[PDB]
Amino acid sequence: RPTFYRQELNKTIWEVPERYQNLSPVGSGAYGSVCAAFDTKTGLRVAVKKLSRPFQSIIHAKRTYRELRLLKHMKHENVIGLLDVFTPARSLEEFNDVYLVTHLMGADLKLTDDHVQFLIYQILRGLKYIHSADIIHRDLKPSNLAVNEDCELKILDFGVATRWYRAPEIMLNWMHYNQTVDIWSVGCIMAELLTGRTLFPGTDHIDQLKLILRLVGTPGAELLKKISSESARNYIQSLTQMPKMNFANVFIGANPLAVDLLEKMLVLDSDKRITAAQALAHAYFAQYHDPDDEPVADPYDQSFESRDLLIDEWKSLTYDEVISFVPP
Ligand SMILES: Cc1ccc(NC(=O)c2ccnc(N3CCOCC3)c2)cc1-n1cnc2ccc(N3CCN(C)CC3)cc2c1=O
């Protein structure tokens, strides 16, 4: 048991191991507030997140468990990993707080084409990894991507409007989806880095769809066959029909290989959209691609998602995961 010490900052008690020094508030993360700190063990800067009321209800309790399970699993250069997890509690009975420690993430995301190449390559390399364990991000956007001064990138979640980057199949719920919802988001981010402008800045779900269809065209007879929802089918067929634009005439003067890749990412049909692994092998990435250094994840059991448990049961499962943690 390490020695803990207490303090108050921003009208909240932080009780942390002596290992972590000089805590400094940096704002809110996903379901908690965050401080920067100094890790005396390595001499590096770290981010410490104290979760907000982790066990107040069933939903909070299961989302606390979800995040801890996920962070303990993800071990890859372009994805956030877990340095430490702790509680000041000495027993399950008095267990009420959870703190998660990671490396101190940098600032978030016109750029040079060489820069666009390296940043999109790193995002796809991280996505090949998470997708290989059937983990889907679902909220990829520039503010959820950390980049240091070396231009190294990690995918994370800090909890730009989300609707601007959302795949139509999960925003409107109109056909089956797969991991490629994240690929649509990547296409939207890449366009923005090439142009300096948000590609589809919609005001609501309806405006958003209107802006999308202006570029990709109204679904034809072949895609309409896969639209599960009758409401959505009627909607689509009632619009004034829009043709597909030539992307080359939209992204004027971009690298033609970039324009080709964008054409393969920004398709409405989820069965036809390029996957992360396929996109790594596209000619655009010739300078960076190495099929021997693009690893997959160990399998991830998420059978817990389908379970219906009491607050104290999620709490005991979370306690177990704190106890069983082993440092990298
Ligand atoms: C410490 C910590 C602990 C946990 C997490 N959790 C996740 O990143 C996360 C949660 C759920 N799913 C994730 N996946 C990523 C991979 O694809 C699948 C989904 C990631 C994040 C942090 N963290 C790290 N550094 C920060 C630096 C500054 C800041 N702040 C606050 C926000 N403002 C905007 C900038 C400075 C916050 C953090 C912050 O939260």
Side-chain angles (χ1 to χ4, degrees):
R1 194 77 176 163
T3 304
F4 284 75
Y5 74 99
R6 316 165 144 277
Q7 76 190 282
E8 173 165 46
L9 40 83
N10 281 138
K11 271 139 67 273
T12 159
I13 298 285
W14 288 66
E15 190 170 18
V16 305
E18 291 185 312
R19 167 182 179 180
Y20 306 106
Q21 292 286 308
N22 289 259
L23 275 62
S24 309
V26 288
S28 339
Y31 315 121
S33 62
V34 182
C35 287
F38 182 80
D39 185 349
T40 61
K41 189 173 159 219
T42 52
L44 305 164
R45 231 130 51 105
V46 294
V48 186
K49 177 168 69 177
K50 179 194 188 198
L51 293 176
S52 315
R53 306 187 202 279
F55 312 112
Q56 193 184 44
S57 59
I58 298 151
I59 304 280
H60 278 209
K62 182 169 175 179
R63 92 185 175 201
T64 297
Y65 182 75
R66 174 182 305 118
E67 186 178 356
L68 179 53
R69 292 285 318 280
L70 197 78
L71 293 178
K72 284 177 62 163
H73 194 83
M74 276 167 333
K75 293 172 173 177
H76 184 279
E77 295 95 337
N78 311 113
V79 184
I80 202 181
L82 189 69
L83 293 187
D84 200 10
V85 51
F86 60 82
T87 182
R90 328 194 72 156
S91 79
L92 180 61
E93 287 205 63
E94 76 186 47
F95 181 51
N96 247 308
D97 286 310
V98 177
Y99 297 76
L100 304 165
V101 189
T102 73
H103 283 125
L104 180 62
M105 289 299 100
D108 67 37
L109 181 63
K110 288 193 189 74
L111 333 183
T112 275
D113 187 64
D114 297 301
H115 269 219
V116 175
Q117 277 171 40
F118 187 47
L119 291 164
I120 305 306
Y121 176 75
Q122 296 176 83
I123 298 169
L124 296 158
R125 194 170 166 272
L127 292 185
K128 179 184 182 180
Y129 179 92
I130 59 158
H131 291 175
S132 77
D134 300 310
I135 292 157
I136 307 165
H137 191 290
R138 295 188 181 152
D139 194 18
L140 276 183
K141 51 179 162 177
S143 61
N144 281 329
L145 299 165
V147 189
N148 69 27
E149 302 182 52
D150 308 89
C151 299
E152 301 167 332
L153 173 155
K154 296 192 188 316
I155 306 161
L156 69 148
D157 196 334
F158 289 133
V160 292
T162 289
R163 81 179 158 269
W164 298 346
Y165 306 90
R166 269 259 141 112
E169 72 274 16
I170 62 172
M171 170 179 76
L172 310 168
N173 215 291
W174 69 11
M175 83 176 299
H176 73 278
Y177 74 103
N178 50 53
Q179 291 103 316
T180 68
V181 300
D182 283 339
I183 297 297
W184 180 272
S185 300
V186 171
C188 292
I189 294 164
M190 179 165 166
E192 183 159 352
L193 301 184
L194 294 167
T195 68
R197 300 184 177 187
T198 309
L199 185 55
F200 301 125
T203 60
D204 53 57
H205 280 207
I206 287 330
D207 190 51
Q208 187 68 33
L209 183 62
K210 181 188 82 154
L211 297 174
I212 294 170
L213 297 187
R214 277 180 188 162
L215 183 73
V216 305
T218 50
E222 299 300 297
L223 179 64
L224 271 169
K225 286 176 174 190
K226 306 170 176 199
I227 300 297
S228 187
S229 177
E230 192 183 22
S231 190
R233 269 208 305 289
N234 287 342
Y235 186 58
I236 292 169
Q237 280 160 276
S238 72
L239 298 167
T240 308
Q241 309 298 120
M242 306 288 281
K244 183 176 171 312
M245 295 190 184
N246 187 344
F247 281 27
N249 300 163
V250 170
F251 302 106
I252 46 166
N255 175 351
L257 296 170
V259 176
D260 186 73
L261 180 65
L262 286 166
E263 288 262 29
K264 291 161 156 79
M265 292 180 167
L266 300 178
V267 300
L268 288 189
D269 190 337
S270 60
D271 295 324
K272 298 323 179 220
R273 201 175 294 150
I274 197 165
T275 60
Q278 289 159 352
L280 289 165
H282 192 276
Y284 186 55
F285 300 118
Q287 193 161 45
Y288 297 101
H289 182 232
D290 174 2
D292 298 332
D293 189 34
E294 297 163 357
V296 299
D298 287 353
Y300 181 57
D301 185 355
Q302 62 183 48
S303 61
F304 77 90
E305 293 283 7
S306 79
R307 295 193 190 110
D308 182 9
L309 304 178
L310 292 197
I311 287 164
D312 273 2
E313 302 167 341
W314 291 115
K315 180 177 178 243
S316 181
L317 297 166
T318 300
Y319 194 58
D320 288 347
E321 298 286 336
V322 174
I323 297 315
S324 77
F325 175 71
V326 31

